[PDB]
Write a protein that binds this DNA or RNA. Structure first.
Length: 60
DNA sequence: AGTAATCCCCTTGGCGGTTAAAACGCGGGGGACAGCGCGTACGTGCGTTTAAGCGGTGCTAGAGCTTGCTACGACCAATTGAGCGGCCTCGGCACCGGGATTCTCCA
């Protein structure tokens, strides 16, 4: 309706996170998921995608 | 306010391989070590003299202690920017290869 396309946060208990990852992919096939969990080194590699410079995200 | 589950993180342990470093064998060389001769250089004893050590006298510098206060640092609250943690990148240093120069050793 408004092309906001994020950033959206989703904060869950740890047993549930793969359920979100999968059900999000099911309930929208074309909508893009960042799975921010793992060891500190793994999170550092994931954090590269947190763009601060746009407060509203493009579909790209 | 307590005690236990949950979850991060970071250390220890194991498995595989690969290859670079440790172990093993062997000839020979030359350095360790015992042996010899000499000779000069250090320990000994004596006579010499030199001044260190002691008992004693004299002075004043300055170590040590008290008094008095005010200049300087301890303490607190409000302000802010210098310095730290996190992210980025590109250029310095390593690593390789190949031909050029050096050094070593037997002739």
């Amino acid at each position: 309706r408004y092309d906001i396309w994020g950033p959206f946060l989703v904060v869950a208990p740890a047993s549930t996170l793969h359920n979100w990852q999968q059900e999000v992919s099911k309930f929208v096939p074309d909508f893009k998921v960042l799975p921010y969990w793992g060891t500190a080194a793994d999170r550092k590699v994931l954090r590269k995608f947190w763009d601060r410079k746009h407060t509203t995200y493009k579909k790209d």
